[PDB]
């Protein structure tokens, strides 16, 4: 209706647009900063894991070497004691006859 | 001592060795399997993360062009509201 009413309504829309612009920046700024912090944390973790995972071939190589030796030891103890039993069971058979 | 004594002693040593060996090997292997489990979990996590982080350049891409569209629209809105104001002020001067 009034001319002065149109002008007031424009002026207010203009102040409200400006506040909305300002507050939306602040929201989006905070949200993107959170996203960056989480990305960064994920990345730092991903890297720690990756180092662990890369080191495994060489750790497992060295384990495999000790394990082979231990398997030979276990086997030999077993064979030795199995052989001692055989030998004494044979001497108890010569003697019992 | 007796030969029978020796035999019985050997047989005790044998069955004990056999079983000690068996348990040591179970313990040794369980420990390896436990390590592998943890590693496999870390890798799955690591790949989940890589997927999130490597679609980031793309997500930033579309974000960017959407943010430029919104800011362009907003700059034109502000030009128009400011032309509306000047013009109504003009008519306001003319009473």
Q: Which of A28, A49, A67, A87 to mutate to test the interface with B (most CBs of B within 10 A)?
A: A49
CB A49 within 8 A of CB B42: yes
Structure obtained using:
X-ray
Q: Where are the beta strands (DSSP E) in chain B?
A: none
Q: What is the resolution of this structure in A?
A: 2.0
Which residues between 55 and 94 in chain A have a beta carbon less than 8 angstroms from any beta carbon of chain B? 56, 63, 67, 70, 74, 77-78, 81-82, 84-85, 88-89, 91-92
Question: CA dist A25 to A21, A33, B71, Å?
Answer: 6, 12, 11
A49's CB contacts (< 8 A; 6+ apart) are B42, B43, B45, B46
Cα Rg of chain A (Å, integer): 41
Tokens, residue A24 = 């939306």
């Amino acid at each position: 209706i009034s001319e002065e009413n149109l002008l007031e309504e424009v002026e207010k829309a203009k102040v409200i647009a400006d506040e909305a612009v300002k507050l939306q920046k602040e929201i989006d700024k905070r949200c993107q900063h959170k996203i960056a912090e989480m990305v960064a944390l994920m990345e730092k973790h991903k890297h720690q894991y990756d180092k662990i995972i890369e080191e495994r071939d060489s750790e497992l190589g060295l384990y495999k070497s000790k394990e082979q030796e231990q398997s030979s030891l276990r086997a030999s103890l077993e064979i030795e004691l199995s052989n001692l039993k055989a030998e004494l069971l044979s001497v108890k058979k010569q003697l019992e006859i």
